[PDB]
Amino acid sequence: GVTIVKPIVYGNVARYFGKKREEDGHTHQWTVYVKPYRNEDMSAYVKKIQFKLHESYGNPLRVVTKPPYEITETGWGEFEIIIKIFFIDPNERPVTLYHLLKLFQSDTNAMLGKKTVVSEFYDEMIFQDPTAMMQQLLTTSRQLTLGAYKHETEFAELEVKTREKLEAAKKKTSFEIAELKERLKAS
């Protein structure tokens, strides 16, 4: 009768090189990742997360161990990445996630000239009737970082949300300086 929910967020960010590789054939540097929504260390209950990429790569099955869980790799096309989350408790069934590697922008986002592509989805790992050890591990998770934790799902809108404040404050300071100090010098 014990149910513990661990919210997570998985996805990938991609950056366009601006030109296709000379002889390789890659166009975007992308980083698939799995990270928690709440500021907590997932490794307290996660043993390893495997990322099975396309067979075209030398090693399709990547692995990570610690709270980040990101592999940086370059590619040329979009494909489905199978993410399998293994827990410390071997009696707990691993969780399998399916994420579509997104590298290209939509026409609307392309017209905006934004360089970074982002696609991560909100998810929750439901542990129904977990073992005593797994329950303790889930309940004893510590905080990961001292700062805040954020997500840029789409980014198209988060960039505008950030700019509306950043550029506003920057322009206000620039004006307060230029309009006032020149007249102060005039006096």
């Binding site: 206000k172 300071t173 307060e176 006032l180 100090k181 102060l184």
Partner: protein, 55 residues
């Protein structure tokens, strides 16, 4: 901040004016301080020998 900064900036102009006033008073940096001293020393100096032996 970034508002009513005149109260803080006019103080710097007043300080510039007081700096000019002080330069007029005795001077901010003494003009041409020790530019040239060509006095050639004596070969040894009898008095320098006396001072050495005195020490």
């Amino acid at each position: 901040k970034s508002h009513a900064e005149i109260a803080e900036q006019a103080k710097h102009e007043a300080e510039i004016e007081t700096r000019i006033a002080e330069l007029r008073k005795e001077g901010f940096w003494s003009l041409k301080r020790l530019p040239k001293v060509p006095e050639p020393p004596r070969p040894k100096g009898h008095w320098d020998y006396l001072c050495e032996e005195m020490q």
